[PDB]
Ligand binder design. Structure first.
Ligand SMILES: CS(=O)(=O)Cc1nc2ccccc2[nH]1
Ligand SMILES: CS(=O)(=O)Cc1nc2ccccc2[nH]1
Lengths: 266, 267
């Protein structure tokens, strides 16, 4: 991997692994999500940051970057043995936080096979309180981002910025009692954000998975699943096939995630 | 990746990923297991086989290669960003089946940081019945294996060939109600063999994990966990070092799926 000529974006190639593919022998959306996360960490390393991509000033204030929303759109999933190239860049969206974008390409043809966007906020790692981005912290990141707007999703009022509603009981489909295992944790012992995508998809029936391909997934992150927590995954068809998703703690029903998926007939 | 000069073994390098490491910021044993599986799959591809590594004759008879035992010994876990190089080769052990071995090295120093061995059997994929390797099928593989014995574990009576006993109730520690999710399945919709290693380790207390490093793991594969099965993971201490006896069984009737042992060293 490497920063591009201007040093304002990062590129990396990946060869799709045998354990990374589904029944179609093409990379799963969780593998795609893990590769986006990997190129994001490598971009942070290449410029001196750090998976919290922190400055020494944020480390002193116990401040970290946390994902608020992830949106992924796949046109063609890379097959087993194929090389996929991913370009990524960050951009501030005012005091709200930062946006990280990705573009996925086929290394052979050069065609865009997918794109992603994510919204991040600044949080005190202990109090879990959002303190919003200050000027002296903002200025430390501005030299690693382009000044002109560079958007993976430029269309006005696109799918990535749509408001997601709360699923109402009874759900059409459900997957109950989901628990994370040690392989679901990251290096800081927190549940990896990709696990939540997997948990959302657990409530999609096998008939949909076998006859359709996932085109779009949008996920909101509200609360973390704290290791010894149990998750319920709820899904209702809202339609192509569209679904509304809800992740909640098995006990009291506290919301952890809300999302939507769009699927195309094979 | 590539076959070595003699075409009798395969080598591949891997850069350790951020999501592949644990709390020590070094590759987990499940990441190591996935990388062993990947270089095994790439060795099969490089010579014409197709993750069952079958010949057209085995495909006609509905025969597959299935793991009976996996044994991994790690001296140093590769850190995040490090390149690890893995060499792998197969060798027949008569009509019983074949053995796949691995040697893990640090690409910078060249020192062996780990090694692994596995025993595989031929099974009919429909009836699940085992049968001895026929001479016509055996001959198809002989040209891709060395003739002289080449062992990752040559030792007189090494840990890789020790018989594992059945854990007796009550277990000291347990992790109940484990279920696989879609990411735990392979391309043929079966539970990936690496998931079982993860399930065994789920019953090790967090105090052991935080104060020790896993040195050896030996796992026997007896029965598959199907998509809709639920697993109970049982562990009892059997011991400077800490040793454990492990059992994976179906939550309901208590049918055994795996039995294993781990050895851990103080940090
Ligand atoms: C919310 S974030 O994307 O983790 C913050 C960030 N902004 C960056 C700019 C360049 C390199 C790494 C960067 N990490
Ligand atoms: C049970 S096994 O070891 O997966 C069968 C096998 N034996 C091989 C020899 C060379 C290349 C691939 C090979 N696959």
């Amino acid at each position: 991997g490497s920063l591009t000529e201007d040093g304002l974006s990062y590129k990396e190639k990946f060869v799709v692994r045998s354990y990374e593919v589904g029944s179609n022998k093409t990379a799963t959306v969780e593998t795609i999500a893990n590769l986006l996360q990997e190129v994001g960490c490598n971009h942070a390393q290449s410029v001196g940051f750090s998976g919290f991509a922190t400055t020494t000033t944020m480390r002193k204030l116990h401040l970290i970057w946390v994902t608020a929303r992830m949106h992924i759109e796949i046109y063609k999933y890379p097959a087993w043995g194929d090389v996929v190239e991913i370009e990524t860049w960050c951009q501030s969206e005012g005091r709200i936080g930062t946006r990280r974008d990705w573009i996925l390409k086929d290394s052979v043809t050069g065609e865009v096979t997918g794109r992603a966007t994510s919204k991040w906020v600044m949080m005190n790692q202990d109090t879990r309180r959002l303190q919003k981005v200050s000027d002296d912290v903002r200025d430390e990141y501005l030299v690693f981002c382009p000044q002109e707007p560079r958007l993976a999703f430029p269309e006005e009022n696109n799918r990535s910025l749509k408001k997601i509603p709360k699923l109402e009981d009874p759900a059409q489909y459900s997957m109950i009692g989901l628990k994370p295992r040690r392989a679901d944790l990251d290096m800081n012992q927190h549940v990896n954000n990709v696990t939540y995508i997997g948990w959302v998809l657990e409530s999609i029936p096998q008939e949909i998975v076998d006859t359709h391909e996932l085109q779009v997934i949008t996920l909101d992150y509200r609360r973390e699943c704290q290791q010894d927590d149990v998750v319920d995954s709820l899904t209702t068809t809202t339609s192509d096939s569209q679904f509304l998703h809800l992740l909640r703690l098995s006990g009291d029903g506290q919301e952890i995630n809300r999302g939507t998926t769009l699927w195309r007939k094979k």
